[PDB]
Amino acid sequence: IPGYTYGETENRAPFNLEDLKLLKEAVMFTAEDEEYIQKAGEVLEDQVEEILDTWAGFVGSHPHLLYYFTSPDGTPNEKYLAAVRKRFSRWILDTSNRSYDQAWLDYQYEIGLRHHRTKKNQTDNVESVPNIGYRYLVAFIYPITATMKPFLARKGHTPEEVEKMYQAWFKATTLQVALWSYPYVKYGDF
Amino acid sequence: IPGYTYGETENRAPFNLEDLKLLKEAVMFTAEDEEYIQKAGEVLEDQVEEILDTWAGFVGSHPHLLYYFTSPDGTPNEKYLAAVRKRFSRWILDTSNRSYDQAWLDYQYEIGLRHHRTKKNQTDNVESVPNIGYRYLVAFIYPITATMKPFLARKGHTPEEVEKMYQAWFKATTLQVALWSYPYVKYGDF
Ligand code: HEM
Numbered sequence: 001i002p003g004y005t006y007g008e009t010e011n012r013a014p015f016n017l018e019d020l021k022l023l024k025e026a027v028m029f030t031a032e033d034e035e036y037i038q039k040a041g042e043v044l045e046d047q048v049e050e051i052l053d054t055w056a057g058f059v060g061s062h063p064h065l066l067y068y069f070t071s072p073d074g075t076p077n078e079k080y081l082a083a084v085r086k087r088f089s090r091w092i093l094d095t096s097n098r099s100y101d102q103a104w105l106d107y108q109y110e111i112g113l114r115h116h117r118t119k120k121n122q123t124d125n126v127e128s129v130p131n132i133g134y135r136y137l138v139a140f141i142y143p144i145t146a147t148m149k150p151f152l153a154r155k156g157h158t159p160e161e162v163e164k165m166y167q168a169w170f171k172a173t174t175l176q177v178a179l180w181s182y183p184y185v186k187y188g189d190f
Numbered sequence: 191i192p193g194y195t196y197g198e199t200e201n202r203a204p205f206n207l208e209d210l211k212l213l214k215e216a217v218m219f220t221a222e223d224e225e226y227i228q229k230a231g232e233v234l235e236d237q238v239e240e241i242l243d244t245w246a247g248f249v250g251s252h253p254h255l256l257y258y259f260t261s262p263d264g265t266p267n268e269k270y271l272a273a274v275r276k277r278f279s280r281w282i283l284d285t286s287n288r289s290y291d292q293a294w295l296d297y298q299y300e301i302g303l304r305h306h307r308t309k310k311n312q313t314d315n316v317e318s319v320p321n322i323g324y325r326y327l328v329a330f331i332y333p334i335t336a337t338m339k340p341f342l343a344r345k346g347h348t349p350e351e352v353e354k355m356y357q358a359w360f361k362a363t364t365l366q367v368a369l370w371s372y373p374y375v376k377y378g379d380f
């Protein structure tokens with residue numbers, strides 16, 4: 001997957017497993033959510049293209065969101081969209097499958113850097129807008145969470161299991177966006 | 191309500207109704223959510239003390255969260271807890287009742303400033319820790335959202351209405367925390 005460097009950034013994040021413990025406590029994530037996020041993995045695995053299609057459509061129908069993938073001339077950069085899509089697809093699986101350990105934290109730092117002006121547009125060597133305003137990363141917790149639900153409700157698992165999968169996904173999405181604030185936030189205020 | 195200055199800050203926020211339109215779009219909030227957040231108001235009104243008790247208990251059982259209300263000596267500042275509780279109670283009602291207009295935005299800027307080192311501890315004239323790390327404002331989207339649900343499910347409204355109220359509350363909580371990032375985020379990156 002071009003540009004996907006999970007587990008091989010060779011850069012230790014500015015947050016560690018104690019930070020992660022305290023953040024999991026604040027978002028109410030426990031060993032129960034680890035179980036159910038993993039169960040979500042098998043449910044979502046074969047639906048990733050339809051999830052991606054849904055999320056492409058939401059972004060594509062909103063000029064002020066599609067903006068973040070545009071070339072200077074205001075048109076979508078199709079190379080950029082396609083390359084990011086492959087890494088986004090993998091992130092769906094990673095969120096369910098990966099242990100949230102230091103390597104995971106090190107990639108969460110990398111993902112935040114790539115939304116921020118620090119590293120945006122470098123992974124794919126594209127010319128596009130410099131920064132994704134942080135307000136929209138927070139806002140996206142809702143669509144990224146909520147639009148997962150109908151996919152979770154498909155694979156013939158019990159509705160009770162679906163709800164536990166869904167709550168685990170809400171917590172995990174929130175946890176990640178909290179970490180991705182790091183490069184955006186004034187030093188010492190995170 | 192001591193320290194509550196909604197509609198009378200006399201300070202225009204650095205975000206306006208166009209910013210709010212675009213943020214509502216990103217969080218999927220529409221006129222339908224305005225209807226259902228308002229309906230939540232009547233449901234939650236008479237339960238605010240029990241909601242507050244629940245949320246006091248969550249914070250109080252976690253030393254690293256109770257930390258934000260502590261005096262220098264590490265003990266909770268009881269004056270500070272009590273005064274903030276009254277403003278938090280009012281915020282529950284405001285979220286349901288208030289029109290999200292410029293006055294509302296101007297108070298969202300104020301609330302963000304009060305979590306941030308810019309204004310924390312000034313409203314109540316207390317000595318406490320300087321800043322609430324932004325990572326925890328994001329993380330709290332989950333408990334502030336999720337722990338509302340059982341309260342919404344009480345007042346004998348239909349479960350379908352409860353779900354719409356709950357989704358409106360999730361969106362509104364997310365929208366607000368996105369705005370409260372403003373004083374935390376490096377200038378030009380919000
Ligand atoms: C809950 C919030 C969000 C999630 C979970 C999310 C997830 C992701 C993931 C997994 C990637 C690829 C990371 C990698 O390189 O391995 C990515 C990249 C990207 N996302 Fe987001 N995203 C979020 C918010 C946003 C928003 C609000 C936008 C605005 C359209 C956006 C636009 C982009 C762009 C343009 C890239 C490529 C950045 C680069 O140049 O490297 N994302 N996102």
Ligand code: HEM
Pocket residue numbers: 193194195249255256258259274277278281301304305309310311312313314322326327328330331334363367
């Ligand atoms: C979804 C996230 C949060 C929401 C909705 C929320 C809501 C509120 C509200 C409504 C107030 C009073 C605002 C006013 O002055 O009128 C407040 C103040 C305060 N909150 Fe939060 N809060 C959030 C996150 C946090 C976190 C993570 C902490 C950590 C314990 C926290 C601790 C405090 C403190 C210490 C104050 C008083 C700040 C000051 O000195 O003025 N809040 N919060």
